[PDB]
């Protein structure tokens, strides 16, 4: 990895564009307001970026020469700031003279607030603040995964509490199926780690090693899975032998939970005749700690869940819980793992509630909806210069495009505070210095090539908890 | 990287679910037909995956032990196939006994056709075929980027040819702005490389080194950029000094093209009064090889482009080209880099055509729309087992879910052929062996830990050309 080649091309040319006599460039990141509405965001992911990409000796003579050679051909011109990068090499042994202050990871902050700020610590490196905008703005992705996952946890929490009276099992109710559906191995790990801020069930193994290496947990692992079938392990038996596949798999996994995809040919037949009759004797014998989890994987998601439950409720003994909602026997559950995103999740649990089914009966799996079907504009994650020093005077700078007030940016030196009512406010124009609003909640997390404050994954999970 | 830890968790448990005495599992990848329709796909990106993740000694003693320890805790049980992985280590020095056949990279193939196949070459490793599904299915991402980019090139080619009579400059008409808007550094490189299959303009630097390392070009680099401003380099001068910023930047870059974002405060004032009056003498003096490129970045994309052009056409000498379309002087161009995706791209060029503006006048930048706002379900990229051998007998296998005939999969051993009319057909059930359709177009690209056939980036670009 070469940080000199990890920026937007045009940023290579910006050192010639700032005002002369500029000694400081100060920039901030927010999830900009736009006036499920995503009113508050989980701040998560910067610590990964700091350690993987920004800390330590990130400049070498070889990296300078490599960048110089690439850019000469890429621009067909000599515009690369070799002098400025060699300065950092010789002066700071290749450590970035940058200070980053950030809200603690896991903090849940309303839209439109400063979440981190970046500035250069040496006047010669005024150009460096926005060089690393591109790498830092990629924090949008773990922020947005963690936020969208938590918003799904809010939906699940509400309907589970309403239909059952408690939140038992909530942390396993949204399973990460997204490994194949994301754009890269690296995205898999980052996105899966952001989901585990809120939940404990994952098949995206990549997230485990990321958390261990960059954040840490008291527990051996941050997330868990169960054995489960795929269409290959069912269909390989032949169409006429689906029952034999089911019987073999539940017997191989007789003492742990086992998920069995049941829609290879006819999900409703599988539920009513194969599970509900031919193999019923292998299901009602199972432990409460080792249920069969029937997995549909096609059709209209709500219609299929509802029909599957109706089928199973006629072949297995249903109870009515203390809230009036129907409950399958404890050895039998369902996981809907197709078509799940935050919108269909809500439709399904509302539809179950209207048909008097407890959310205890169901868990969800989500892949592309959870980790890939997300963009930087969902929360308007954005990085802008708000303050410069030129000729020794600080000036508050901003954009304010005539045709879109939503893209107006903040002015001056910024700080994040609690309000008297316990909410959040970002103070602009250095007004945090007046000390009317208590302590700035941004802390220095990076300075001159060293990570200066770190959070464990356990702390992040605590910070990101739901009120309830 | 540890490929033992680079699969969906549940696949760790599948070796215990296949039929006993299974010696062969054979699977295939397609962009499934679903009933911009995306009727044909660019096959690109498998060679990256083969070289970075699958080739060579990918199993070691340490990797087996690492995976054993992680899965013990992740499943809270001993289901990991330590013996099977030890077999590969001991028998093949950690090389995967897998054979992959694939259509040549860059090939443009209609939906619903086999693009690559995977099978084990040792009967003990029947479970390995679908272990590596997860990593191989991530090829959906370079396929989809390349396809969606090529579809945008088709739109630009149509309207450029109608409004100018040629395709001059086509390969620079859609510039990759997506580095900050993707989910990771790895995704940035893969996605930018996929865009460079069709175009030459990019600010996602990460794409260059990926191509150099994994594909290769005769030219020094596969893509190019120009100097350009951002809001920080304009607003740092102060709101009242926007003119001074503009003058400085165009004078710093007097003899190469320079793009200057012009909407910090009022795009229309910047065009009409700052560029169109105050600084006009610095624009009309510029060379045809070094235009000013004015960049709006906010507002309704079509409305803003049309109003910017109308303004500029009243302040600068417009000609009428041989097709009857209006054309700015050669020292002045526009780039629309906000809100561009395949849908708005079409809207803008059609709206320009209706107002008699040549597409010569404009280029587009696209970031999230080009590299991030894409999912595996756009082309229904999918990997399924179609053939197994069990007790020495091959059987053709498939899924066929009752509620969604679109998820029906192909049966048996597959091959890809030219039809008598020169189209493509996928033959199922081993019928390619009949030789009624000539030779299979798939080539073995990986066998027993080695890449056996490969393509330069130059060949890929040739294969992906538009008909025109
Ligand atoms: O069942 C599992 O343990 C499992 C783990 C990973 C993926 N899957 C399946 O993979 C598919 C991913 O699709 P998607 O659209 O959510 O990206 C979906 O059918 C899931 O049920 C299933
Ligand atoms: O002008 C450039 O060279 C340039 C290079 C990289 C990114 N950008 C800008 O960054 C923004 C990317 O936003 P998006 O939503 O397309 O991902 C958009 O306003 C672009 O104009 C601009
Ligand atoms: Cl599956
Ligand atoms: Cl910009």
């Amino acid at each position: 990895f070469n940080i000199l080649l990890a920026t937007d091309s045009y940023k290579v040319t910006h050192y010639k564009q700032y005002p002369p006599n500029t000694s400081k460039v100060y920039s901030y990141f927010e999830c900009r307001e736009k006036k499920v509405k995503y009113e508050e965001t989980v701040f998560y992911g910067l610590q990964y970026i700091l350690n993987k990409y920004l800390k330590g000796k990130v400049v070498t003579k070889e990296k300078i020469q490599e960048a110089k050679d690439v850019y000469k051909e890429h621009f067909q011109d000599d515009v690369f700031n070799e002098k400025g990068w060699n300065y950092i090499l010789e002066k700071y042994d290749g450590h970035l003279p940058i200070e980053i202050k950030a809200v603690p990871e896991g903090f849940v902050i309303p839209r439109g607030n400063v979440l981190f700020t970046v500035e250069n610590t040496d006047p010669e490196c005024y150009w460096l603040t926005n060089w690393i905008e591109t790498i830092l703005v990629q924090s949008w992705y773990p922020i947005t995964v963690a936020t969208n996952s938590r918003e799904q946890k809010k939906i699940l929490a509400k309907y589970l509490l309403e239909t059952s009276g408690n939140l038992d099992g909530l942390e396993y109710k949204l399973h990460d199926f997204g490994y194949r559906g994301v754009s890269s191995q690296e995205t898999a790990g980052i996105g899966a780690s952001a989901h585990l801020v809120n939940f404990k069930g994952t098949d995206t193994v990549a997230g485990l090693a990321l958390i261990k290496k960059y954040y840490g947990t008291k527990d051996p692992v941050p997330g868990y899975s169960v054995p489960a079938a795929e269409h290959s392990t069912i269909t390989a038996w032949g169409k006429d032998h689906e029952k034999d596949a089911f019987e073999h798999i539940v017997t191989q996994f007789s003492s742990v939970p086992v998920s069995v995809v049941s829609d290879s040919y006819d999900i409703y037949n599988a539920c009513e005749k194969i599970w509900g009759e031919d193999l019923r004797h292998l299901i009602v014998s199972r432990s409460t700690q080792a249920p069969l989890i029937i997995r549909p994987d096609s059709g209209n998601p709500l219609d299929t869940v509802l029909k599957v439950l109706e089928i199973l409720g006629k072949k297995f003994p249903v109870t009515e819980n203390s809230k009036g909602y129907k409950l399958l026997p404890p050895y039998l559950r369902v996981i809907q793992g197709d078509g799940v995103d935050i919108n269909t999740l809500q439709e399904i649990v509302e539809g179950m509630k209207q048909k008097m089914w407890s959310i205890e009966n169901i868990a969800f799996g989500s892949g592309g909806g959870l980790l890939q079907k997300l963009t930087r504009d969902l929360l308007n994650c954005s990085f802008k210069c708000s303050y410069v020093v030129t000729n020794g005077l600080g000036i508050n700078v901003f954009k304010d495009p005539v045709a879109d007030p939503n893209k107006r940016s903040k002015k001056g030196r910024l700080s994040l505070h609690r309000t008297p009512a316990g909410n959040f406010v970002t103070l602009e124009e250095g007004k945090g210095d007046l000390e009317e609003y208590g302590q700035d909640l941004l802390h220095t997390v990076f300075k001159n090539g060293k990570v200066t404050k770190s959070y464990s994954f356990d702390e992040i999970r605590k910070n990101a908890q739901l009120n309830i």
Side-chain angles (χ1 to χ4, degrees), chain A:
Chain A
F1 180 84
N2 187 347
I3 195 177
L4 282 71
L5 296 172
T7 192
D8 297 293
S9 298
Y10 73 154
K11 283 169 177 297
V12 173
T13 75
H14 292 171
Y15 69 110
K16 299 177 144 158
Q17 303 181 25
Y18 287 103
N21 304 298
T22 288
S23 55
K24 167 90 79 183
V25 170
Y26 172 108
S27 292
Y28 78 99
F29 178 97
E30 58 168 330
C31 298
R32 196 166 61 239
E33 281 186 274
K34 190 188 137 235
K35 195 108 90 72
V36 171
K37 319 201 175 90
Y38 296 101
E39 297 191 17
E40 63 184 7
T41 69
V42 179
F43 183 67
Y44 168 72
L46 171 59
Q47 187 165 299
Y48 169 78
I49 298 172
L50 301 175
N51 283 279
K52 189 167 179 77
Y53 292 127
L54 296 183
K55 74 172 182 187
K57 176 163 180 93
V58 298
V59 191
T60 68
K61 229 291 94 196
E62 291 73 20
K63 283 173 176 181
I64 293 179
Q65 188 66 50
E66 179 189 21
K68 178 179 177 167
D69 289 336
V70 170
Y71 289 136
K72 212 171 298 304
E73 302 293 342
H74 181 58
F75 291 102
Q76 301 270 299
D77 194 19
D78 206 11
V79 55
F80 172 66
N81 186 8
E82 185 187 3
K83 200 173 301 189
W85 278 109
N86 195 64
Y87 178 78
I88 293 160
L89 179 50
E90 288 173 356
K91 184 82 178 299
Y92 297 105
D93 190 38
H95 288 54
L96 301 178
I98 285 279
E99 185 172 9
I100 305 178
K101 300 174 190 189
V103 66
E105 296 210 14
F107 265 51
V108 177
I109 303 298
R111 293 290 281 279
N113 282 293
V114 63
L115 304 177
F116 62 90
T117 66
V118 185
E119 67 198 282
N120 59 296
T121 61
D122 178 329
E124 290 290 326
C125 303
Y126 68 92
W127 56 268
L128 180 62
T129 303
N130 274 44
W131 188 280
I132 60 174
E133 165 177 16
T134 316
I135 180 120
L136 287 177
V137 161
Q138 292 190 332
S139 71
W140 78 261
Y141 175 70
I143 291 168
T144 302
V145 175
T147 298
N148 184 63
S149 169
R150 183 166 184 282
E151 288 297 311
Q152 288 173 96
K153 189 174 176 184
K154 293 181 171 170
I155 294 159
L156 286 160
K158 175 189 196 300
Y159 282 84
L160 190 57
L161 192 72
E162 183 172 18
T163 62
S164 83
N166 56 80
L167 298 176
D168 293 3
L170 174 64
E171 47 176 27
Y172 291 99
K173 286 288 191 206
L174 189 56
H175 204 104
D176 175 349
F177 285 0
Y179 205 167
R180 83 195 52 188
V182 295
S183 48
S184 68
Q185 290 293 313
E186 187 182 11
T187 290
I190 299 163
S193 71
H195 179 63
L196 293 163
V197 166
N198 307 292
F199 293 89
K200 272 173 159 293
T202 185
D203 268 45
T204 302
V205 179
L208 310 187
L210 187 151
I211 284 164
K212 178 167 194 172
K213 173 172 188 191
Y214 291 100
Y215 286 97
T217 52
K218 294 174 198 44
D219 294 314
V221 290
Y224 302 91
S225 193
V226 300
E230 70 180 29
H231 293 97
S232 87
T233 62
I234 302 312
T235 62
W237 295 73
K239 177 167 158 46
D240 289 339
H241 296 272
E242 188 177 23
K243 172 182 55 154
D244 296 315
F246 289 2
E247 176 163 21
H248 174 84
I249 294 174
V250 300
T251 304
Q252 296 281 65
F253 300 106
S254 62
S255 62
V256 289
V258 66
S259 158
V260 182
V261 67
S262 298
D263 77 327
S264 295
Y265 314 108
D266 188 331
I267 176 65
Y268 306 121
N269 173 258
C271 289
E272 190 169 282
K273 293 293 181 176
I274 304 183
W275 295 128
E277 293 189 356
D278 302 341
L279 295 190
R280 189 189 190 275
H281 61 279
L282 303 176
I283 297 340
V284 305
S285 62
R286 299 186 64 97
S287 164
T288 291
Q289 295 69 41
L292 174 65
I293 305 164
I294 294 174
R295 178 159 73 94
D297 189 64
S298 53
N300 180 280
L302 171 63
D303 296 344
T304 302
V305 163
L306 290 181
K307 184 165 175 170
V308 162
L309 290 165
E310 171 183 23
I311 290 173
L312 294 173
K314 283 169 178 336
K315 309 301 290 191
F316 291 93
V318 181
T319 65
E320 185 176 295
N321 73 19
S322 72
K323 300 313 234 209
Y325 288 87
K326 296 199 286 192
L327 184 61
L328 287 174
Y331 46 70
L332 190 52
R333 292 287 182 269
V334 178
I335 182 164
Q336 170 58 281
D338 171 71
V340 179
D341 65 19
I342 183 156
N343 297 315
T344 57
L345 181 65
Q346 166 72 51
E347 287 165 7
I348 293 163
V349 296
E350 171 63 20
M352 288 180 64
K353 172 185 172 193
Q354 292 300 330
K355 293 298 163 55
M356 322 201 339
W357 289 100
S358 175
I359 304 322
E360 301 164 273
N361 291 297
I362 193 80
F364 298 88
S366 179
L370 184 75
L371 302 189
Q372 181 65 31
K373 197 173 70 152
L374 303 162
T375 59
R376 194 176 60 96
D377 47 70
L378 185 57
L379 312 176
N380 287 129
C381 305
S382 188
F383 186 105
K384 296 294 176 286
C385 174
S386 66
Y387 180 79
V388 306
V389 178
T390 304
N391 284 310
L393 37 82
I395 63 176
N396 303 338
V397 296
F398 65 99
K399 63 187 290 205
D400 191 13
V402 72
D404 191 349
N406 287 322
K407 295 190 152 197
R408 186 180 181 161
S409 64
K410 300 181 187 307
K411 306 180 183 181
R413 295 173 44 247
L414 305 182
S415 57
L416 185 60
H417 303 267
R418 296 288 184 172
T419 65
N423 300 120
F424 294 89
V425 64
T426 290
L427 292 180
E428 297 182 42
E429 296 168 338
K431 290 175 176 175
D433 295 337
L434 306 177
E435 295 183 309
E436 303 173 0
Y437 273 94
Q439 280 205 27
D440 191 4
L441 312 176
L442 313 180
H443 297 268
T444 298
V445 293
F446 181 102
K447 193 169 186 194
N448 304 325
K450 303 326 297 131
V451 171
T452 55
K453 178 135 175 42
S454 297
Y455 300 90
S456 77
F457 201 70
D458 291 324
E459 302 178 79
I460 295 172
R461 286 180 153 168
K462 177 172 141 140
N463 289 341
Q465 285 185 296
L466 299 189
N467 285 319
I468 68 99

